Structure formats: C-alpha cells, structure tokens
Amino acid sequence: MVGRRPGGGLKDTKPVVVRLYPDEIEALKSRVPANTSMSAYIRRIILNHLEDE
Amino acid sequence: MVGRRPGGGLKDTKPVVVRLYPDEIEALKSRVPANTSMSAYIRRIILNHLEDE
C-alpha cells in the first residue's frame, strides 16, 4: 500500500468519454435491470472486464 | 433497425461518458496501441457485450 484507495467507495472513478451505437443503446435499455442505470450497468461490465483482462 | 447503423463513422455512435478507476486506467494505458485513441478504442470492448452478448 504505497498508492491505493482514492475516492472513498463512491467517487473513485475518473470520467472517460466514449461512444455506443444508437440502435443497440435503445435495445439495451429493454434488457437492463430497473434497479440499475445504464451508466452504472456499463461500469459494472467494465469492472468485471478489468479483472478478466 | 434490423441490423444497420447510421451512415457516417463520425455519428455512427452516440456520445456517452463512462467512469473507470484510476489504477485500472493506469494498467490500461500501458497496453494501448499507437493508432486508435482511447475514446474510440474502448468502443470495441463495450460493443462485444452488445452483439456477442
């Protein structure tokens, strides 16, 4: 531990601007959990992706 | 659409902000190519979860 744990279990994430295909965006919201915003949905996806690669 | 996206690779995808953790971005920047920039490079990663999944 010489450089770990910023944010505070909430604001730990830095803003990265990206793009997604409009068709699959509106299609995606039809299959996302109502108790999870599309933003939070993408974040949990990439989170599980970084531990994979 | 059935399987087609808007013409023109400058507006084929809508702009959206995703927030990733600093150390994970720091691990990512070390393995990025010298051709495609981040905002466009990350687009392939999320796309996989749409079309493949």
Six token digits for residue B30: 């070390």
User: Of 3.40.50.300, 1.10.1220.60, 3.40.50.12160, 3.40.50.150, which CATH number belongs to B1-53?
Assistant: 1.10.1220.60
Q: What is the dihedral of CA A16, A21, A23, A24, to 10 degrees?
A: -70
- Asked if residue A14 lies in contact with residue A8, where contact means CB atoms within 8 angstroms, the answer is no
Helix (H) or strand (E) holding B52: none
Q: Which of B5, B10, B12, B24 to mutate against chain A (most A CBs within 10 Å)?
A: B24
Contacts of A45 in chain B (CB under 8 A): 46, 49
What is the residue extent of each domain of chain A? 1-53
- As a whole number of angstroms, the longest Cα–Cα distance in chain B is 39
Distances in Å between the Cα of A40 and the Cα atoms of A46, B30, B37 are: 10, 25, 23
Interchain CB contact of B27 with A (< 8 Å): yes
Q: With an 8 Å Cβ cutoff, is A8 touching chain B?
A: no
Experimental approach taken: NMR
Distance CA A37, CA A26 (A): 13
